[PDB]
Amino acid sequence: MSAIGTVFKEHVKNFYLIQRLAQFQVKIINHSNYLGVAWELINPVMQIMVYWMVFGLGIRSNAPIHGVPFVYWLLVGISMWFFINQGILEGTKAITQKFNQVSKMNFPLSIIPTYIVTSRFYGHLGLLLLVIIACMFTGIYPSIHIIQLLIYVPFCFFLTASVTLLTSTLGVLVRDTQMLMQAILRILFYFSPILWLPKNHGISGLIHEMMKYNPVYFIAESYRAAILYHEWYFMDHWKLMLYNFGIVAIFFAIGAYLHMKYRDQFADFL
Template sequence: MNAVWLVFKEHFKNFYLIKRLAEFQLRLSNHSNYLGMAWELLNPGLQIAVYWFVFGLGMRSNAPHDGVPFIYWLIVGISMWFFVNQGVLEGTKAIASKYNHVAKMNFPLSIIPTYIVFSRFYGHIGLLAIVMVICYFAGYHPSIYTVQLLLYVPYAFILTAAISLVTSTLGVLIRDTQMAMQAFMRIVFFVSSILIVPPKGIVTDVMQLNPVYFLAESYRAAILYKDWYFISHWELAVYNIAIVIVLFIVGSILHVKYRDHFADFM
């Protein structure tokens, strides 16, 4: 468990550095675009419009889901996906792409995937704020249940960072990891409740093993359904907490074991 403590300590001691690097990375990612950081919101908006047109108007004839108009059900459930997807994919290649910049420095390598994920977290907060404003004008006003977002939003970040800690190390050791994660994240998207929730049964039971399912449904419970989701589905909440703990432990062990040899794999 020394590896776990070491990685945790590096993150705790360098929190301010993570924040500063995340802000720099966010500006760097958008500095050559005419619209700059506006793309952090425009790109998700365009994708949501396509999903609503195909799955809402096309397949469902804009029928409501559990009494909620499909468009609001969709935007709340998908609001965290753009962050999780981008965070995992960019976090996977973080060490491989940034290692040469810090190789000759006494730099805590474990924070590289974390600050890359953090750079995408700002866009998620902005998109979530816009989604809540849209829902407000649709009659879904903030309530005591909205406080749950103070649990679910940090969980989305911690989950994404934990996954990236594992995949960023694998991305150095096995270069095919980046392509494999792109394919895997497409599967994760469709095997979740973002676009459709099947009737109760074996399919739903399998989908609930996907942490993105928990995030989509918990966001909807906080904003649309007025339900204490982590209480009414406490088994699912415990399962998802366990996933994060396991990912962080495995990621820490892998990272500490191989980081002194990253130069040999680059």
């Protein structure tokens, strides 16, 4: 119980340091590019264009889903994936790379992955704003149901932060985890409603049941319900919310316990 208290205290006291270091990292990454920080938004747009060309025109010839054009359906569904993928990939190696600089300075070591994640949360917020503006240009306008984002958007950040908090310690102790993460990320990507709805195309007794255990399913469906279908998602899907909250709590507790156990020996393992 002391682990959770220590990590919580560190984060709630070093919020501002987290934000400042995230901004500095964003500046560092895109230093040599002529366009600068615009690539954080340019790259996801090109990737989304490729994904729509492949999975939108080839498989289904751009047939509308639920009365919404497929382009906007995919746009709302996929606006979150880049943040999760980049955060989980980059923050797993955060402690390994950034320990040397801050080893000899009195530093709260549990906030290293969090600002790595924030450096991508910035681009996610920008992409979400762009997507909302485009959907408004289509003819779909916001309603009172848009206020569910204040609850749904922080959940994605908390999930990514907890997963990264566990995986950073695991990667520091054993270096095979960083190589093993790629297949798991691919599994999470393909077994989700981001690109397709398997109910119409194929059977739903087996494929759909496994999809419900994937948090990306819940996140994408909640965003679509808040932005597109104009409904209260928690009215009929509260059990999924409870299960996801339990998953987040379990991940946070395990990561905090491991980090508190092995922080003083991080020099030997590195």
